[PDB]
Design a protein around this ligand. Structure first.
Ligand SMILES: O=C1N2C=C(c3ccc(O)cc3)N=C(Cc3ccccc3)C2=N[C@@]1(Cc1ccc(O)cc1)OO
Length: 189
């Protein structure tokens, strides 16, 4: 049962997003732009994963929509306090879509990531997730990727499906659901 009540003043939720903001803030100057985030998505990640041009474009559209949802825009430098305010708005919007069974931006981003790794179908193997964790940088420890797979409910083949990862991500990024704690092992607090 996905937790839908927000916990935006909990220091653990704040710290999770500050950890991610600093991870996005490559030069350490306390500011990030949508340009930087889309370059990470397309020039770095999709290139290394050998995504097709169509896949790369779809993933880029999803990343653009997701981070515009938390107030970022091309040419706009955003610092952490405003980024966190944006995340509150994003979470509020996403949870209302989820409750109405309207596709969320986090689900659509997930569909784009999973499609790059697609035999059949809408699943990711542990080896594929370990590669993603290194290439995205969100989880470069293969042990942390292993923990993700232990944490989640996997399919019959031991693979992860986008429905499961979506439910986990709602709890991890938006509501600080205790059921999502540990989703990224020790890699993301
Ligand atoms: O969830 C994810 N992420 C969340 C944040 C992030 C960033 C800032 C925050 O404050 C909080 C979270 N940053 C990145 C890494 C990334 C960022 C920008 C562009 C491309 C990749 C990231 N990669 C994902 C991609 C994903 C999405 C849905 C799935 O089903 C599977 C995989 O899996 O971990």
């Amino acid at each position: 049962a996905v937790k839908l009540k927000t916990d935006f003043d909990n220091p653990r939720w704040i710290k999770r997003h500050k950890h991610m903001f600093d991870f996005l803030d490559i030069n350490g100057n306390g500011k990030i732009t949508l340009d930087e985030i889309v370059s990470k998505a397309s020039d770095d990640i999709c290139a290394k994963l050998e995504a097709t041009p169509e896949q790369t474009k779809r993933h880029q559209v999803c990343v653009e929509a997701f981070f515009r949802g938390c107030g970022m825009e091309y040419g706009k430098e955003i610092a952490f306090p405003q980024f966190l305010d944006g995340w509150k708005q994003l979470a509020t919007s996403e949870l209302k879509k989820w409750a109405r069974n309207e596709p969320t931006l986090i689900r659509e981003w997930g569909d784009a990531v999973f499609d790059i790794f697609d035999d059949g179908s809408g699943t990711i193997t542990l080896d594929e997730w370990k590669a993603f964790g290194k290439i995205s940088g969100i989880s470069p420890s293969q042990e942390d990727c292993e923990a993700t797979f232990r944490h989640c409910d996997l399919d019959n083949s031991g693979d992860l499906d986008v429905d499961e990862m979506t439910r986990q991500h709602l709890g991890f990024w938006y509501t600080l659901d205790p059921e999502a704690d540990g989703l990224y092992g020790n890699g993301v607090p």
